[PDB]
Amino acid sequence: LLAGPPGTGKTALALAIAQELGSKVPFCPMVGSEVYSTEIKKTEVLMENFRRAIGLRIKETKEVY
Amino acid sequence: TQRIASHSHVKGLGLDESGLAKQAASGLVGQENAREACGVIVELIKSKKMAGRAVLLAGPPGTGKTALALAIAQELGSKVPFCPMVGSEVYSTEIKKTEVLMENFRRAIGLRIKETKEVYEGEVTELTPCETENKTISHVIIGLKTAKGTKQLKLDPSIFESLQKERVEAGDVIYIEANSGAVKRQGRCDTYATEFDLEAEEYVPLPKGDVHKKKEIIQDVTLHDLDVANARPQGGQDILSMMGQLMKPKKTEITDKLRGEINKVVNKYIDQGIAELVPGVLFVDEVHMLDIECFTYLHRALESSIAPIVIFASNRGNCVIRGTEDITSPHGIPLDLLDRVMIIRTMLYTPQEMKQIIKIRAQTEGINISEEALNHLGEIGTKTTLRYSVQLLTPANLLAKINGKDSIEKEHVEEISELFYDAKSSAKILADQQ
Amino acid sequence: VRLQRICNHPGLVEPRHPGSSYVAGPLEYPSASLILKALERDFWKEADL
Amino acid sequence: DVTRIERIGAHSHIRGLGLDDALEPRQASQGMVGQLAARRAAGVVLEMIREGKIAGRAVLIAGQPGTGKTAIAMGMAQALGPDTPFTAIAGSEIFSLEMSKTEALTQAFRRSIGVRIKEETEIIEGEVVEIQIDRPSKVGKLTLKTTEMETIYDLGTKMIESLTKDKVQAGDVITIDKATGKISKLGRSFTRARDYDAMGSQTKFVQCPDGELQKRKEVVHTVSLHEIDVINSRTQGFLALFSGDTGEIKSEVREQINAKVAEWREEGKAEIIPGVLFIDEVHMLDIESFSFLNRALESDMAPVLIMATNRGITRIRGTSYQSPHGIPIDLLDRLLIVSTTPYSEKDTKQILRIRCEEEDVEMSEDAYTVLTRIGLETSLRYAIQLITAASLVCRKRKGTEVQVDDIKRVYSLFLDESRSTQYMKEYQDAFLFN
Amino acid sequence: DVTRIERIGAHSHIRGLGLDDALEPRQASQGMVGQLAARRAAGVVLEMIREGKIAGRAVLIAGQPGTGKTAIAMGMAQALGPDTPFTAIAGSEIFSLEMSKTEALTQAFRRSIGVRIKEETEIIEGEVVEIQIDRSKVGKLTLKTTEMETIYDLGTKMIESLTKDKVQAGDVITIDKATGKISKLGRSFTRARDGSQTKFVQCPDGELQKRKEVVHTVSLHEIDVINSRTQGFLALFSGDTGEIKSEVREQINAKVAEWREEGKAEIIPGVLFIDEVHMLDIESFSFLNRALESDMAPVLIMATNRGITRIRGTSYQSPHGIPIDLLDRLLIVSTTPYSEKDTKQILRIRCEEEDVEMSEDAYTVLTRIGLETSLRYAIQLITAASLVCRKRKGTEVQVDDIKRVYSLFLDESRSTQYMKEYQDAFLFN
């Protein structure tokens, strides 16, 4: 939890973590208001984003004539 | 004969050539100031120059707010759109409230379009496909016969499938509309009527006009019809449209892009001389049932250049606006919307006006009534309310008929008032007798 | 003569006609070709999951 | 034996209003007893319904619980008869998830208006004397007779198809629609041959038709406006008549249907049969519902509205305000109020006597006196409910009449509200969430 | 004149911001009057918009009712022009049953960012006076053109396409060299001579194969909806978009960035205008806090009058009915009430737009009424007074006509008084 007054750089530090990790690690940004969907329940939205923050890196060879 | 209703006696505003209100004319009596104001609004509507101008009829209950709004509709005539509405209708389960309001805004804008329709009709002499690989039908050849001649035509395979639709065969009479591709098999020709003693077919005569006819008509539509017809398309021939039509139809939240495109093509029709615009009136009775979201949306809607004239009606006092939970305002309406509105003041009626309206409703419903019973009903109306006094006429007439009389007398009105009680009297029973 | 025509049948003067809808035609919404090439990816970095 | 689906309900004993030809109520007739003024008023309202001239009149039945408001409603329903519509609902039924409250009330309003469609048809009806089909394009020949005449028909192909699919054979009595060749089989006049094995259903016989083989007849079909709306709402929308998926029928469809029904009325095709909508326990309606009813009652296609409620000064749902009967005074001004009074000792005794007759129960006069005093002390419905229990108790002891001891036995077994509340207050710590 | 679909409305008279090249406002120009500080601020914001470098900028226009903040926004829309997006909504419109509040704001944001694409085409044109086409199939394209005739050898494997969509003698057509499409113009008088609403052009010109570039501006929302479904483009008209998946949006952002760096596309940032933002709730404002932190975000403009007012969805109160978490992330433009001269000039402009002539005494009386009651009330009386003058066959509006209309139609201040005189008659106070 990043806590403090407004304007003290909480979001900036989170995006700094994202920059430091690099693009090859998943970083799923989210706002708390996004859980209130009309199609699915809130816990489903949370679990979907949880799965969205976990990455899988598949290696394969493509051969073609 | 048509059924009598509450406002069936209203035929117009009863104004003279100078715009002033006659004391009793066109079913309305009294209320001269509001009738003159409504006449000014009628002049505003018929000018067709303005958009989004709004009016509120405000006054106590029973003073004729709804009657004057319907009197405007009679004064305008049936050529101008008049879309009545009540504020409770915005709470739909299928679409949001603002969409309901905007749909009713578009319903009040009319459009008279000149349409040119190509039609083919005649007895099918022969019907032969033509197919080939690019395997598939390139077109179908069809011959048609009428009293004035015959002709050979080649048509799209969609119309060919729309012919196999109707089980059409040689000797059958058909009607094709080339604009939509609609096909109707009217029946079999009357030439083959004598060929059997009993046969399940239905026979029709041969057509007498030309095989191919080019006809011009004028179609009455609204902008909402154009919006809905393109939002949920229905006239296609592709398989995907047919699959989509199998879905249960529901109202959708139509976008502003579609409405802009419809405005564009309507303007093209008007510039080409094909169409004439007939902007009309939206009438929202009991706007106090709208909530603060609906009122706030009307700020933008009433400021549009496309919008119609709008007429509001409300009877509330300094009442709480719905959806705000502590904000009182006059007429149950926000101040900001009320600034955008011309208010027409409606007044209570004197006893003489009540008697005159009761007499008008009596002769409207087909009821003879003595002067004593009329005065007694006027006294009852002053004591309780106008609408209660008017409602006693038909039961009293029924009692008089049961007694063999051809006219209401005072005793029948007394008996009906004893049998049927008013809201104030019933409330007194609840409060005092308990 | 006109009154006699009316006396015979009013369709000799004012025949009834079939009601019908106003065929409007499609709207023809245009756009560019690259819009349909979105989500396309490339063979050496996609598909076969 | 033979328990049909209709068993003895709460209002099964009511079969009318028990009124004289002059609408003067009898003290006991057609299952109704007491409530003279209310029954007279209901008779006047029933005459208004029967004449059908006036549209959208509204009536409220008011009084304490157990005073026969619903009984008067079912009395009107039974006296009115089945030919005229009578749609009955509770106020809670409009709160649907499929549609809005206004849509539900619109459907309920239009269920209560009948359209008596009338058209001419030609039939061929006769006993099949002979049929022949030379199937290899098919050809055939048919012979029909009545008691008066006989005729041979050379058949067309599609008639042969219909005859073969229906498996028409000689000895049958059939009716053939001349317009479309539909066949309907009424029965047989001659037995099938007894030489044939296994096809040996005995069946029953029907007389030969009389008169001409071919006749023209008038036929009348009755449908509600809601049925016409649902059928025309969408393609294959007739299924929603049974399933109820009538979600938010578009208003333009209803306007078109009203215009077509009016022009059918002028063109001699149809007659409008306006019925009744009954809403029991109308205090469950929201303020929006009453606001919608205010304008819905002003249409010429509106039916007669009847409502029943018991509340005094009581909160309107959806608001923080209070008004008489839990109804806003906007609507109470538009309607006439019918008041039901509490019953006396003799009226209670007569109701119990009538109820015993309906349930086939014999009781002594002391039992009637005791049950009458119980009903005056606790409630009418409780005393009515004790009748069946006392009869069962008498039956299990192999008695022939219900005696005072059986009544006291069931009074001990089954408790009323007052005693149960008293005993609950004794166990007030044991009961939950006081 | 024939009535077009657009008719004269509340903000039809304003056609821009009345600013010189130095963004200094004129007293009366382009239909706008007064509000010099607010107009200058709006001009600065407009120059910020059309440069397009800075993303996610937010502005609020605040003031008393009737002070022209909505007029200022419409002037910004007119001055910006149609070449840049300008999405306008009310705050009540995001409360959809089809989608969530955040999704509605998301696609309102994305409608305000345009993607501009240029595409090259090769096209052949000719007049169909006759077709010597047999359909395998054989033909030679016996069509005409002013410079030299459109005769041209054809590949036999596809000539049926030329005869497919009812190509008939007496027409003019165009053909694509690479796509193979064919299109028609209709009953041209030069070819059809021997229908209404057909192309009435003469014989076409040019050297047959003509080069043509075409420019399309497509919003990000259009790219989202088109690629979300097999026939998703219908949802742009029907509004049957559900909640679009996030996976579609980031792929499209990546593709748009790739096109931008590759030079195949250009980004055209626009404006989202939300009038009456006090209908939004805490959830919407909280979403707007982070939606404005995207590089692909537009300029946001908001309007609300309010004072210290309750935030919807809460018991808390805040200035402008907005939380202070969002007010820190925006610049506030203040509109002041109008003077007598500005009111008179606005009435003069409105009378000109409505084509109404009035006396100077009538202007004085109407300006008195405008300050006394309200500006919008005084604007309403112009049309009614003109109608009353017309019915008496007058040429110019006089003071008597305005007094007559003032007697007939009345404002809130007098309606409330008359209501209070009959307090028991009016309901549910």
Cα–Cα distance, E32 to E11 (Å, whole number) = 10
Q: What are the DSSP calls for E144-204, one per residue? A: B-SSS-------TTSHHHHTTT---SSEEEEEETTT--EEE----HHHH---TTS----S-
Chains B and C touch (3+ CB pairs under 8 A): yes
Contact with chain B for residue D266, Cβ under 8 A: no
- A31–E290: do the CB atoms touch at under 8 Å? yes
Q: What share of chain C is helix, strand, coil (3-state, %, to 5)?
A: 25, 0, 75
SS (H, E, C) B126-191: EEEEEEECCCEEEEEEEEEEECCEEEEEEECHHHHHHHHHCCCCCCEEEEEECCCCEEEEEEEEHH
Strands of E331-335's sheet, edge to edge?
E86-90, E271-275, E299-304, E58-63, E331-335
Contact with chain B for residue C20, Cβ under 8 A: yes
Cα–Cα distance, D429 to D126 (Å, whole number) = 81
Query: CB–CB of B52/E9 below 8 Å?
Result: yes
Same domain, yes or no: E236 and E327: yes
Distance from CA of B1 to the nearest CA of E (A): 38
* Token pair for B21: 């209100």
* Token pair for A65: 């004539």
Pick the closest to residue B233 from B274, B277, B175, B180 (CA basis): B180
Same domain, yes or no: D283 and D312: yes
Q: Which domain holds residue B411?
A: 349-432
Pick the closest to residue B159 from B178, B187, B146, B186 (CA basis): B178
Same domain, yes or no: B67 and B216: no
* Token pair for E306: 């309010």
Instruction: Give the one of E12, E408, E428 whose C-beta lies nearest to B33's C-beta.
Output: E408
From chain D, pick out residues whose CB is under 8 angstroms from the CB of E428: 321
Cα–Cα distance, D22 to D25 (Å, whole number) = 9
Same domain, yes or no: B236 and B102: yes
Same domain, yes or no: E257 and E288: yes
Domain count, chain B: 3
Same domain, yes or no: B56 and B139: no
Cα–Cα distance, E321 to B38 (Å, whole number) = 38
Cα–Cα distance, E79 to E47 (Å, whole number) = 10
Sequence-distant (6+) residues with CB within 8 A of B27 are B9, B10, B11, B12, B14, B71, B360, B364
Q: What share of chain E is helix, strand, coil (3-state, %, to 5)?
A: 40, 20, 40
Q: How many CB atoms lie within 10 A of CB B209?
A: 13
Cα-based angle B265, B271, B276 (whole degrees, multiple of 5): 80
Strands of B54-58's sheet, edge to edge?
B82-86, B281-285, B309-314, B54-58, B342-345
Pick the closest to residue E271 from E51, E118, E99, E100 (CA basis): E51
Cα–Cα distance, B196 to D156 (Å, whole number) = 6
Cα–Cα distance, B258 to B233 (Å, whole number) = 12
Cα–Cα distance, D424 to D237 (Å, whole number) = 53
Query: CB–CB of E221/E105 below 8 Å?
Result: no
Query: CB–CB of B54/B263 below 8 Å?
Result: no
Sequence-distant (6+) residues with CB within 8 A of E72 are E17, E32, E35, E38, E39, E42, E61, E333, E335
Query: CB–CB of B13/B28 below 8 Å?
Result: yes
E367 annotated to a ligand binding site: no
Q: Which of E275, E307, E338 is the last residue of a domain?
A: E338
- C43–A58: do the CB atoms touch at under 8 Å? no
Q: Which residue has the tokens 């001349």?
A: D178
Query: CB–CB of E308/E317 below 8 Å?
Result: yes
Strand partners, D177: D123
The answer to the question of residue D247 being in a domain is yes
Name the experimental technique. cryo-EM
* Angstrom distances, CA of residue D309 to CA of A36, D277, D316, E398: 41, 15, 13, 59
Same domain, yes or no: B335 and B263: yes
* Token pair for B7: 């406002």
Q: Which of B229, B246, B271 is the last residue of a domain?
A: B229
Residue D60 belongs to what H/E stretch?
Answer: strand D58-63
Cα–Cα distance, E414 to B297 (Å, whole number) = 26
Q: Which of E318, E338, E358 is the last residue of a domain?
A: E338
Q: Residue type at B166?
A: E
Detail the DSSP E strand segments found in B210-289: 212-222, 275-279, 281-285
Same domain, yes or no: D22 and D86: yes
Same domain, yes or no: E284 and E347: no
Query: CB–CB of E335/E110 below 8 Å?
Result: no
The answer to the question of residue E194 being in a domain is no
How many CB contacts within 8 angstroms connect chain A with chain C?
5
Cα–Cα distance, E35 to E42 (Å, whole number) = 10
Cα-based angle D209, D213, D218 (whole degrees, multiple of 5): 90
| A63 to chain C: closest CA residue | C44
Pick the closest to residue E95 from B288, A35, B297 (CA basis): B297
Sequence-distant (6+) residues with CB within 8 A of C19 are none
Q: What are the DSSP calls for E88-152, one per residue? A: EEEGGGG--SSS-HHHHHHHHHHHTEEEEEEEEEEEEEEEES----B---B-----B-SSS----
Strand partners, D4: none
Same domain, yes or no: B58 and B199: no
The answer to the question of residue D58 being in a domain is yes
Q: Which residue has the tokens 């063999």?
A: B404
By three-state DSSP, how is residue E85 classified?
Answer: coil
Contact with chain E for residue B289, Cβ under 8 A: no
Backbone φ, ψ for residue E266 (5° rounding)? -135, 140
- How far is Cα of residue E368 from the mean position of the Cα atoms in its chain? 35
Given resolution (angstroms): 2.4
Virtual torsion, Cα B412, B415, B416, B418, nearest 10 deg: 160
Cα–Cα distance, D130 to D169 (Å, whole number) = 8
Detail the DSSP E strand segments found in D80-149: 86-90, 113-134, 139-145
Is residue D81 classed exposed, middle or buried when 0-12, 13-18 and 19+ CB atoms within 10 A define those classes? Answer: exposed
Same domain, yes or no: B126 and B211: yes
Contact with chain E for residue B115, Cβ under 8 A: no
Cα–Cα distance, E72 to E44 (Å, whole number) = 13
Contacts 24+ apart (CB under 8 A), A34-42: A34/E100, A34/E102, A34/E287, A36/E100, A36/E101, A36/E102, A36/E283, A37/E100, A37/E243, A38/E97, A38/E98, A38/E99, A38/E100, A38/E243, A39/E242, A39/E243
Sequence-distant (6+) residues with CB within 8 A of E263 are none
Domain CATH number, residue B180 = 2.40.50.360
Same domain, yes or no: D293 and D386: no
- Residue of A15, A34, A36 best to disrupt the E interface, most CBs of E under 10 A: A34
Q: Which of D281, D314, D343 is the last residue of a domain?
A: D343
Radius of gyration of chain C (CA): 31
From chain B, pick out residues whose CB is under 8 angstroms from the CB of D158: 199-201
- B198–D52: do the CB atoms touch at under 8 Å? no
The answer to the question of residue E171 being in a domain is no
* Token pair for E339: 């003077």
Same domain, yes or no: B312 and B396: no
Total residues belonging to chain E: 429
Domain CATH number, residue D380 = 1.10.8.60
Cα–Cα distance, D79 to E35 (Å, whole number) = 74
Backbone φ, ψ for residue D171 (5° rounding)? 90, -20
Cα–Cα distance, C48 to E335 (Å, whole number) = 60
Domain count, chain E: 2
From chain C, pick out residues whose CB is under 8 angstroms from the CB of E264: 34
Chains A and B touch (3+ CB pairs under 8 A): no
Residues ending a continuous segment of chain B before a break (C–N > 2.5 Å) = 134
Kind of pairing, strands E32-33 and E58-63?
A: unpaired
| C29 to chain E: closest CA residue | E233
Contact with chain B for residue D123, Cβ under 8 A: no
Q: Which of B326, B348, B370 is the last residue of a domain?
A: B348
* Token pair for A29: 């940004």
Sequence-distant (6+) residues with CB within 8 A of E238 are B231, B232, B252, B254, B255, B258
Q: Which domain holds residue E325?
A: 9-113+219-338
Same domain, yes or no: E265 and E240: yes
Contact with chain D for residue E425, Cβ under 8 A: no
Query: CB–CB of B323/B293 below 8 Å?
Result: yes
Same domain, yes or no: E304 and E383: no
Contact with chain D for residue B398, Cβ under 8 A: yes
The answer to the question of residue D109 being in a domain is yes
Contact with chain A for residue C22, Cβ under 8 A: no
- D residues 304-363 closer than 8 Å to E (CB): 321, 328-330
Q: Which of B348, B363, B394 is the last residue of a domain?
A: B348
Sequence-distant (6+) residues with CB within 8 A of D221 are D116, D117, D118, D119
From chain B, pick out residues whose CB is under 8 angstroms from the CB of D274: 3
Q: What are the DSSP calls for A22-63, one per residue? A: -TTS------GGGG--SSS-HHHHHHHHHHHTS---------
- A residues 30-59 closer than 8 Å to C (CB): 58
Sequence-distant (6+) residues with CB within 8 A of D178 are D121, D122, D123, D124, D214
- How far is Cα of residue B109 from the mean position of the Cα atoms in its chain? 12
Instruction: Give the one of C17, C20, C22 whose C-beta lies nearest to B221's C-beta.
Output: C22
Same domain, yes or no: E294 and E361: no
The answer to the question of residue E16 being in a domain is yes
Work out the end-to-end distance of chain C between its first and last CA atoms, rounded to an integer number of angstroms: 85
Residue B354 belongs to what H/E stretch?
Answer: helix B351-365
E69 annotated to a ligand binding site: yes
Kind of pairing, strands E317-319 and B212-222?
A: unpaired
Domain CATH number, residue D52 = 3.40.50.300
Query: What is the DSSP code (8-state) at residue B2?
Result: P
Chains A and D touch (3+ CB pairs under 8 A): no
Pick the closest to residue E227 from E253, E264, E265 (CA basis): E253
- Residue of C22, C35, C42, C49 best to disrupt the E interface, most CBs of E under 10 A: C35
Total residues belonging to chain A: 65
Domain CATH number, residue B398 = 1.10.8.60
Cα–Cα distance, E206 to E125 (Å, whole number) = 8
Contact with chain B for residue D295, Cβ under 8 A: yes
The answer to the question of residue E76 being in a domain is yes
Distance from CA of E298 to the nearest CA of C (A): 21
Cα–Cα distance, D167 to D133 (Å, whole number) = 12
Same domain, yes or no: E353 and E312: no
Pick the closest to residue B304 from B46, B79, B21, B53 (CA basis): B53
The answer to the question of residue D361 being in a domain is yes
Same domain, yes or no: E282 and E398: no
Q: What are the DSSP calls for D137-202, one per residue? A: --EEEEEEE-SS-EEEEEE-HHHHHHHHHHT--TTEEEEEETTT--EEEEEESSPPPTTSSS----
Sequence-distant (6+) residues with CB within 8 A of C38 are E223, E226, E227, E251, E252, E255
* Angstrom distances, CA of residue B406 to CA of A18, B363, B368, B409: 93, 14, 7, 10
Residue D339 belongs to what H/E stretch?
Answer: strand D335-340
From chain E, pick out residues whose CB is under 8 angstroms from the CB of D328: 427
Count helices and strands (H / E) in chain D.
14, 16
- B3–D297: do the CB atoms touch at under 8 Å? no
Query: CB–CB of B115/B319 below 8 Å?
Result: no
From chain E, pick out residues whose CB is under 8 angstroms from the CB of A52: 246
Same domain, yes or no: D352 and D338: no
Same domain, yes or no: B40 and B67: yes
By three-state DSSP, how is residue D340 classified?
Answer: strand
Q: How many CB atoms lie within 10 A of CB E248?
A: 18
Strand partners, B285: B86, B313
Cα–Cα distance, D161 to D157 (Å, whole number) = 6
